[PDB]
């Protein structure tokens, strides 16, 4: 039931999503090893993901969390980078999209920095880079990130390096 609707670059929604993508780029401590060397992106397309069933699945859970947290879902918009974007947009997030070895245990990880999610587009640590050129810093191959609505509810604060 998923359909993808292209946004016009003239659309205010295209423009606010691009700005959140571009302005949350930072330098990484790996010097670009995992995600490549860049200060900005060339945005090729932004599509709105529409799936009734997945959305109702989200809003059902959102309301459960909210009623457990004084009517506050603590909803954020966050980036997610994965080799499995095409399975996610059709079937939703599940256990198969978890980072089993992540710093905070086996769960589904999201970032405020788009450049952090970009380090995972081609796998953990960037895997072996783009499928065509085996280059974690490929400037040619098209990459995909998701910009996602995430319910945090009451979040456990972990301080970290």
């Amino acid at each position: 039931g998923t359909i993808l609707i292209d946004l016009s670059p003239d659309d205010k929604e295209f423009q606010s999503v691009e700005e959140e993508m571009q302005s949350t780029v930072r330098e990484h401590r790996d010097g670009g090893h995992a995600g490549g060397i860049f200060n900005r992106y060339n945005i090729l397309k932004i599509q709105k993901v529409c799936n009734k069933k997945l959305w109702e699945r989200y809003t059902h859970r959102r309301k459960e969390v909210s009623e457990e947290n004084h009517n506050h879902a603590n909803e954020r918009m966050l980036f997610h980078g994965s080799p499995f974007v095409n399975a996610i947009i059709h079937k939703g997030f599940d256990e198969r999209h978890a980072y089993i070895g992540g710093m905070f245990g086996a769960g589904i990880y999201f970032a405020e920095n788009s450049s952090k999610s970009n380090q995972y587009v081609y796998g953990i640590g960037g895997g072996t880079g783009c499928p065509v050129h085996k280059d974690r810093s490929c400037y040619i191959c098209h990459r995909q990130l998701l910009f996602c609505r995430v319910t945090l509810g009451k979040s456990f604060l972990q301080f970290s390096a």
Partner: protein, 47 residues
């Protein structure tokens, strides 16, 4: 897939060294996220 800490619905990873890093977050139920936008892009080689 692990569980949230008791009494919590997610984990926030707060940066404690890299003064420029923003936060990272973890959820433990797939139903707690909806993939709203698919962004197709290239990284750009700095000039």
């Amino acid at each position: 897939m692990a569980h949230s800490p008791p009494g919590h619905h997610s984990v926030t990873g707060r940066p404690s060294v890299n003064g420029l890093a923003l936060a990272e977050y973890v959820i433990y139920r797939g139903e707690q996220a909806y993939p709203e936008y698919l962004i197709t892009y290239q990284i750009m080689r700095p000039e």
